């Protein structure tokens, strides 16, 4: 799903909208080791279009929650 989500978010950024782009990034971070394809583009959009104090804490929180979900069963 992230395969189309990334292109659609790029198109959304090209149009001039940022909120729904990050919204679909968190939406796609919900479908699902060696899964760097998620985080590489996720953090790339974070660096290119993200504020230091406004947004980083919550989405790094979500990253930690996803990793804990993965680590719960092993």
């Amino acid at each position: 799903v992230k395969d189309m989500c990334l292109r659609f978010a790029e198109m959304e950024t090209k149009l001039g909208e940022i909120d729904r782009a990050r919204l679909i990034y968190i939406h796609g971070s919900q479908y699902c080791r060696v899964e760097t394809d998620y985080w590489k583009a996720w953090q790339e959009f974070e660096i290119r279009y993200g504020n230091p104090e406004e947004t980083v804490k919550e989405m790094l929180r979500i990253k930690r929650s996803v990793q804990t979900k993965f680590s719960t069963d092993s």
């Binding site: 919204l23 968190i26 939406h27 919900q30 953090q43 974070e46 660096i47 230091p52 980083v56 804490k57 919550e58 790094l60 929180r61 979500i62 930690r64 929650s65 996803v66 804990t68 979900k69």
Partner: protein, 60 residues
């Protein structure tokens, strides 16, 4: 001694703490509706803050 003065002290202590707690859960549940999230959201803690600037330092 006081079934009313002491009651307010328990009510005060509870009441202001639930306000900050309801603040977080209202904030986090609003984000999951606009994202169709299905997982529990844990408190930010100091660990995320320590990692946040560490992540942020390499960004800039």
């Amino acid at each position: 001694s006081d079934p009313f003065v002491s009651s307010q002290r328990l009510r005060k202590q509870f009441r202001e703490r639930k306000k900050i707690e309801k603040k977080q859960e209202a904030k986090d549940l609003s984000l999951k509706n606009r994202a169709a999230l299905d997982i529990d959201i844990l408190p930010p803690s100091s660990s995320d803050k320590d990692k946040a600037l560490l992540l942020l330092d390499n960004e800039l």
